[PDB]
Amino acid sequence: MFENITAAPADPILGLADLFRADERPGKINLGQGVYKDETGKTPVLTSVKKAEQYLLENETTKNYLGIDGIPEFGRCTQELLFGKGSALINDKRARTAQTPGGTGALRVAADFLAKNTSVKRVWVSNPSWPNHKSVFNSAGLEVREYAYYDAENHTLDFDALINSLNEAQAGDVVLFHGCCHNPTGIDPTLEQWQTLAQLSVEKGWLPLFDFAQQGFARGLEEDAEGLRAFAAMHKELIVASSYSKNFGLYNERVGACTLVAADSETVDRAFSQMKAAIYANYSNPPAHGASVVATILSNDALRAIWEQELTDMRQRIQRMRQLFVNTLQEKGANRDFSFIIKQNGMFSFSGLTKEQVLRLREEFGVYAVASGRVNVAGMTPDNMAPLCEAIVAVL
Amino acid sequence: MFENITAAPADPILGLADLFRADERPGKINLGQGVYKDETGKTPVLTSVKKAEQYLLENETTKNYLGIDGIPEFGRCTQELLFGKGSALINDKRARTAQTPGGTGALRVAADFLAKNTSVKRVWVSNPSWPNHKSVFNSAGLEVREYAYYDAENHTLDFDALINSLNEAQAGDVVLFHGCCHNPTGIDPTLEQWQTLAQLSVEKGWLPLFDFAQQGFARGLEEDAEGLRAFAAMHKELIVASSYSKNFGLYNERVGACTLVAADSETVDRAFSQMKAAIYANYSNPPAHGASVVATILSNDALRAIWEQELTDMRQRIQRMRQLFVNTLQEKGANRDFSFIIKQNGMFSFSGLTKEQVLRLREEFGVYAVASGRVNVAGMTPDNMAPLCEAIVAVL
Numbered sequence A, B: 001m002f003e004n005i006t007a008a009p010a011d012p013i014l015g016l017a018d019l020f021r022a023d024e025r026p027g028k029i030n031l032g033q034g035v036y037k038d039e040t041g042k043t044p045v046l047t048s049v050k051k052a053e054q055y056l057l058e059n060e061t062t063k064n065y066l067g068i069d070g071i072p073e074f075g076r077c078t079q080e081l082l083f084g085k086g087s088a089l090i091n092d093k094r095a096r097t098a099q100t101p102g103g104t105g106a107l108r109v110a111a112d113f114l115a116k117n118t119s120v121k122r123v124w125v126s127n128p129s130w131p132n133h134k135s136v137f138n139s140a141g142l143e144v145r146e147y148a149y150y151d152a153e154n155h156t157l158d159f160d161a162l163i164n165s166l167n168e169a170q171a172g173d174v175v176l177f178h179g180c181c182h183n184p185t186g187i188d189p190t191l192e193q194w195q196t197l198a199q200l201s202v203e204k205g206w207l208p209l210f211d212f213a214q215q216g217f218a219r220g221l222e223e224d225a226e227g228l229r230a231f232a233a234m235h236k237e238l239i240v241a242s243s244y245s246k247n248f249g250l251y252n253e254r255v256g257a258c259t260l261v262a263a264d265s266e267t268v269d270r271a272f273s274q275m276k277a278a279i280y281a282n283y284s285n286p287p288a289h290g291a292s293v294v295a296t297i298l299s300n301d302a303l304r305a306i307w308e309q310e311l312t313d314m315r316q317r318i319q320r321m322r323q324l325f326v327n328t329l330q331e332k333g334a335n336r337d338f339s340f341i342i343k344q345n346g347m348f349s350f351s352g353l354t355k356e357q358v359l360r361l362r363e364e365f366g367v368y369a370v371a372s373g374r375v376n377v378a379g380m381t382p383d384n385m386a387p388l389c390e391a392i393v394a395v396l
């Protein structure tokens, strides 16, 4: 039965990691990953997380299954983060949240829910997006189409091209928006642009799907949710897939949420029953440890304060590295202006390096970026900045 | 878009739990769950698990993502449990294991892998099976057909009817077997019956899919895997979905494995690349905490010994409750022989109670079984046995 199965293709991001591990040279610089790294180049467990895990070790008396939708406090804390305390969506009980195995799991649950229970056939994603979006939606039987996003000429949002692209989307199509810290470009809509998109989406009959992988990494928790909240003010229905992997440093514990919003409480509860059915037929119920850590932190004043400061420290270190990168390239004699990097948000930027320049950076200099030119700014440190920028200047 | 979604149906097992929670009467007895309970009626965290979690708290320095297939040591320990240390399958590198979110997650991964990469259209399951089998396979686009299993007349395996049922299965169909502790009946094939089935499956061209939810709860770790190993001796290809929920008391941490076996190392690696693709498009990579606990225990002589004794204690307590149940029914004056209960294995038995007798038990006596008559033997204690058996005698 398995004799003639074709091997799955290499995969751009995970394949690069395989190459970095096989490479035994000494001065190597990894900008090709999707995790935060601190000034020492490590991805530590957050202190707030360790404190929460100690509390769980001391206090948990059972591992009995969670509900299909997971820990209730986790859902409540998630909705407050997304929509704001005192949001009409929360007051009117228009939103239901399922705890999921990561943001990826949330996207998969959303896709299965939509494929099985609605007329949705098509999801629009930005060009470029995280390559896993296509894989997730396709696995549910949904077609993926691209909308213009990235202005490759000046590394900004091509807003006119975006609008014109999305004219082809029909009423009842889903449109995926990265809520902040776009992956891979780090280019986000301004608030006014979000507001323009919110109005257009209502007019055109799109179902918005927001993906929040990095809430807190652009400007702050509340600011980063502005775009979502502009949509939420205008729409009867939307879905949010959110992740706590980066902002809690909980990658491998698989901590995410799928939040369903409908016009009223009766409708959302009915629809959510089918979202729960989609989860039941997938992994039954979600993993407790990471989500319990998040709920424990978010619901405790002391822990939440420690965590919010840790998140602020990550956001600020990335901002420092953006500035340092631009400054250092200038003083090492780079032949183009890199100031666009300062305007980009979160973990990722498109460097504007060509695929051949990135190949040369890996082969000649041991500097690892994704083939698209995506760099993880959190992979930069004061200690590796000079060699990194020297290598980049050399390939320009 | 969500206006006319139909609510998902009630669900027999989870719905009963909802009824038990709403019921505020005092002497209630819950036999309707799928978790182990000790003599105090609680589902404790195992001591070996607490010790392992303390070690992780003290020693983990990152939560960076696991590989798509999870922790390597977890995979190795899993294959040894299933196939035996020194199995030819392991020596010949014919097996690859992905860590998954629970046994349910493993079944889903298997189903998605098969739907996308093989000619499989149809999965055969026992009548009765765990109702989630149908939901999982159907969600992947696979048809489910039933084979005869339970002899409702004398509460034994109807082996002739089973064989005759499976004559309708075509070459290339999947046949699901519960490896031990059948859910819901607790009726397992003898070794000779397993051997007969293994031979028939080779002859007929079935792909065996084993589901192991309760390894160690029938007779012991090695004994409970005998049936699987009889199949593994005969087949080029099979899949195993296994769970550590019950045998490690790790239900909510979602700890399972999907193990793919093919004719040789080249073939299994190629096929497994597509199993990894199926995981990537679902939840990306698996939750680390519970699987790390299992790997930590299984790979440490001291912890493994503590755990194996805890598992032995659970297995033995269930056996004591089976005997006590039969004895107590006899002395309370039951009008039928219940000796079949002693021959059944693991958490579950079919009581032979009718749907109306179970309704009456809930409404009049506050005794909760599943509508099919499934009881969780681990829900029985020395303290609740007399009232339980008095209620049963009353409805006969």
Ligand SMILES: Cc1ncc(COP(=O)(O)O)c(CN)c1O
Pocket: A034, A101, A102, A103, A104, A105, A130, A178, A183, A211, A212, A213, A242, A243, A244, A245, A251, A255, A256, B283, B284
């Ligand atoms: C755009 C985007 N969406 C979703 C995710 C999901 O991450 P996870 O499944 O680890 O939560 C990520 C993180 N790679 C991302 O960058």
Ligand SMILES: Cc1ncc(COP(=O)(O)O)c(CN)c1O
Pocket: A283, A284, B034, B101, B102, B103, B104, B105, B130, B178, B183, B211, B212, B213, B242, B243, B244, B245, B251, B255, B256
């Ligand atoms: C037959 C069977 N298969 C699979 C499972 C999967 O359990 P889990 O997903 O919690 O590992 C169970 C436990 N209800 C079961 O009884």
